[PDB]
RNA sequence: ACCUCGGAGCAGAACCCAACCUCCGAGCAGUACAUGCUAAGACUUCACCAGUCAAAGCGAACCUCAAUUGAUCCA
C-alpha cells in the first residue's frame, strides 16, 4: 500500500532523506532542512527503494 | 626527558644530537620491526626547558 | 599602563579605555587573563592574541535591560 | 581459540575479535551498537543516536576478548593522529 | 487443544525508583508507569512513556493535591462538567524539593 | 578545483532556490484550493 | 490491612443517594473556583504547600503604624451613589459604553488611590519584597503619609521613587527632592538605607542618609546627622535595595549616638541597623512613609568606589555548584567516550614517563 | 608592608536578600512541571483576573503565592469614572490602571494564563492591548540555565 | 497442537513468578517533513545482545498508538 521512497535535495549537496508514502500518489515535493546548507530547502522524490 | 638526560649528563649538548645519540644515552628505546618511524619531540615541560 | 603606552595610537588607545574599562584597574593599567592552557607558553600567547585582537578591534540579556530601560523612560517621561 | 599453533607453538588470535573491536591500553574494550545500520526508517532518531554511539564492554566481555587476542594486540601504539590517544589512560579513577 | 496462545510476556519491572525522602539528582526516573498512576508535581518533569524524573536535585516528596485539567483536554474536561457540585477530585503528586541553591555571588577581583 | 566546482554547483542552486520556495508554496495553497473545492462538491 | 482517616474525605459531604437530583458544575471556571479554594483549605495529609510554602510564625505581625484614619461610611456611601448615578444620567456615558470608546482619568484615579487604598497596597507591596522582614524583623506599618521623592536630573527632568523601581546611581548621585502633605507644629525624620550592598556583614546594611527634626513640607532646614552617600551596588552582585523612612516625631530627639560626622566616607562608620535605630528610639517617633527602589551597578559606582571611598572596587560574578557526576568505574559497561571525557581533567595531551 | 585600608574588608561570599535578585538576574528557578494539570506554575510573576458578577479584580502574584500588585473596579478610584464595572471598557480601565501600577513597582515581565474562552473574549484582548501599550511584557524572558 | 511480541487473571498492596493454565490481541495504520544535531543524569523484561526516558546547549518554531518486529556475515 506504502512505499519507502529516497528524496534528494535541490540544492545539489547531495543530501537525502527516505520516507513512505502511499504508492497511488504523485512524486513527492517536500520543504526539508538541509544540514550542509543549513537551512530548509525542497526536497523531490527520485527513487522508491522497497514497497510498505 | 630531555632535561634530565643532559642535566644527568647522558646526553652531550655540546655536540648534535640525533636518534644515535638519544638511543646511546638511552632516553628513548626505539623499535623499527614495531612499526616506528622515529622520535616526536612533544611539549611537557616547555615551562622549564 | 593604557594611557601611558606609545605603541598603541591615541583614537584606538581612548577607544580601548571606554570599551574595556571592565578591565582597567584604579592605577591605569589594563589587565589580561589566561587560564586555558596548563602551559604559560601557550596562556602568554593567549595574552598577546588578546591584546592584538583588541587593538585591531579598536582600529576597525540585552532584551532585559533594554525592556527595563524602556520602562525607566517611561517613569522618567514628567516634566516640571 | 588454538592455543599451541602446528608451526610454531603459540597462542594465536581471533581476527573476528580483531576486526570488530579496539581495544584502549588501560584495559577496555570499544565496539559498535549492534543493528546501527539496519531498518533506520523503522528506528527512531533518538534511537538512531544511541545505535551510533561507541560503546564500552563488560569486564567479563573485556576478560574474554583479552584471552581470545594475543599480547601483541595489548602494547602500546604511539600513532601519529590517533583520536583515541586520550582515550587510552584512565584519569581520577579511584578502586 | 489449549487454543488459548499468547500471553507470554514478561514483567515490565515498572513502578516507583526513588521513595519517598530519597535524595535524587536531576534526570534521575522517579517512576515509571504503564498509566497516569502518580501525577508530576514540582521540579518533576514527564516523558513520553509517561514517566517520572527529577528536573532538579533533591528531596522526593509524594503529595495528594486537586486536579485542574487543561482546558483543552476533552475526556477530562467532560468528566469534570459532569462531577457534581461540592466535589474536588484528588490525584496523587511527585515532587522534587531542591536542596542547593543556583549558585553563589563570590569575590574574583580587586579592580 | 573539485571543491570550487562543488561549492558553485550549490552556489548556483540557492540563487536559484527561494523561487522554487514561492512557486511550490502557491502550487500547494492550489492543492488546498483544489481539495477544498472536491470537498465542496 | 486499613487504617481509618485522620479526617473528613473530601468528598463525603456529598450525598450519594441519586445522583441525578444533586446540582452540577456545568463550567471548568465553577469546578476551578471550588478546586482552588479546597486547594486554599488546611488539609490534614501532606500538601505541596507544606513542603514548598514559606512557614511564617502565627504571631500576627505587630502594627507599629500610625492609627487608620476615621470616614464616616453612611456619607461616604451617600456621595459615592449620588456620583455613581449623575454619571449614569449623563446620556453620553451610555453611548461611549456600548460604543466601546470610553476612557478613564488615570492621573486622577492615582491620586485619590493614593488617598484611598495605595497605603494597604504599599504595605503589601512592602512586605513582598521583605523590608518589614529585614529592616523591621517582621513588624508591619501601614504607610499612612505620601512620601513623594523625586531625583532632580538633566535641568528638566525628574527620576522618581515611588515603590521599587530601577534608578541608576547616576541619577542617584544627587539628593533627590522630597515632598510630603503635612501641618504645622508636627516633627519628621527621613532615613535612606540600603538593606543590600554590605561587603562584609551578611546582616547589615549601610545607612546613605539621615535627616533628622524636619520642621514640615520643607526638607531643606533639618539637621543634617549624616551626609547622602549615593548607592554603590557592586559589580555582578546583583540587584540592591534602597529604602526611604519617614517617622512621625511628636517631640524633638537628640540625635547624638546616630551622628555620623563631617563627610562620612567609611563604611564601618556608615554601618546601620533600623532594627536597633527603633528599638533605642522607639518611644519617640512612629513610621508613617517608606518608599524604596532597585539599584545595579554603574560607571557612576566606579567613581564612588575610586575617588569618593578611596576604594578598589569589588568584583563578584555569580557561579554554580560543579556537576554531580557519579563514582567513575573501571568499566563503564554501556557508556561512551565522552564517558571518559567527562572525569577528563585536562584538555591537552599527557605523555607520563616519556 | 602596606597598611590595608579598613574599608576594604569585604567578605569572599556576597549575601544578596533582595527576593527579586536572581529573578531579575533571569537565574532564578522556575517551578517547572505540573504538566498534566492547569495552570502551568512555571513563571515568576502571574496575572490573574476574576470577572464576577458584579466587579472585575485583576491581580500581579508570585509563585509562592503572594499578591505583588492589584487593582480591581471594586474600589472608588475606579467605580467613579465606569459607567458599569463589567464592560470590555471596565476592563480595559483596569488593564491601564494596572500597567501603570506594574511600571511604578517594577514589574515588567509577567505570564498571563488565559483559559481559550478567556483569550477569545474581548475583555481579555483589549485587557492585553491596554497592558502591552501601557509598557508591561506578558512573556517572561527564558532561565538562564548556564 | 504450539514455537516471536503485547494486555488482563492466576500473581488482591515495591519488583519478580510457572502449567499442552483461563481470555483478548499484534506482524499496522494515520500525521509530519527540524520525524535536525548534540549532550548531564537515569531506567531496563532478572545475563549479554537489544530496548526506554531525558535537563541543558546549537539550530528552528513562536507525533498518535500496545504489541505493530529479525543480529552477524554477505549482496
Ligand atoms: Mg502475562
Ligand atoms: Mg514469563
Ligand atoms: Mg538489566
Ligand atoms: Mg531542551
Redesign the interface.
Known sequence: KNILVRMVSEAGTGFCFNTKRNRLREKLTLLHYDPVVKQRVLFVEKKKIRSL | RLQYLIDLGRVDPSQPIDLTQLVNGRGVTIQPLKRDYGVQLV?EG??TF | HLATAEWIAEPVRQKIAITH?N????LGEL?LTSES?????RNLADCLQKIRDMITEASQ?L??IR??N???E???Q??? | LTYFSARKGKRKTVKAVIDRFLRLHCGLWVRRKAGYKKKLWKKTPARKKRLREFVFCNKTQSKLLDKMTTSFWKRRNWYVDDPYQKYHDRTNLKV | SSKNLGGKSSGRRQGIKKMEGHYVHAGNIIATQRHFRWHPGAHVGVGKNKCLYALEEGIVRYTKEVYVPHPRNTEAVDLITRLPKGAVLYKTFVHVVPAKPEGTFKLVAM? | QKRREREQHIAECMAKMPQMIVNWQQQQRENWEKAQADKER | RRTPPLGPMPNSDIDLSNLERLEKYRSFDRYRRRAEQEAQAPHWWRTYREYFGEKTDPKEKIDIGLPPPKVSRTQQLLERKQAIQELRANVEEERAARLRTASVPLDAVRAEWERTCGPYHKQRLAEYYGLYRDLFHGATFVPRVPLHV?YAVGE?????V?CG??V?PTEAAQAPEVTYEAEEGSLWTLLLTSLDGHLLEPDAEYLHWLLTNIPGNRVAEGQVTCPYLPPFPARGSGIHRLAFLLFKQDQPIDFSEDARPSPCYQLAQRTFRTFDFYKKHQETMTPAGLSFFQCRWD?SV?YIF?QLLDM??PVFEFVRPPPYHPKQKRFPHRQPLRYLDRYRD?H?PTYGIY | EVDPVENEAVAPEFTNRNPRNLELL?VARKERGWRTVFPSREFWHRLRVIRTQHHVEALVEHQNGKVVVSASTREWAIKKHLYSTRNVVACESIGRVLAQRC??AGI??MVYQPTPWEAASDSMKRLQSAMTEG???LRE?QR?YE
Open positions: 611539549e616547555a615551562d | 574599562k578591565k582597567i584597574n584604579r589587565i592552557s596548563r602551559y604559560q607558553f540579556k532584551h532585559r525592556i527595563e524602556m520602562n525607566r517611561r517613569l522618567r514628567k516634566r516640571i | 579592580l | 523625586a528638566d527632568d525628574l527620576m522618581p515611588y523601581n530601577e541608576t560607571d566606579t575610586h578598589r572596587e585536562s591537552e | 533571569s511600571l511604578e515588567n515581565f509598557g508591561v511584557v524572558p538562564i
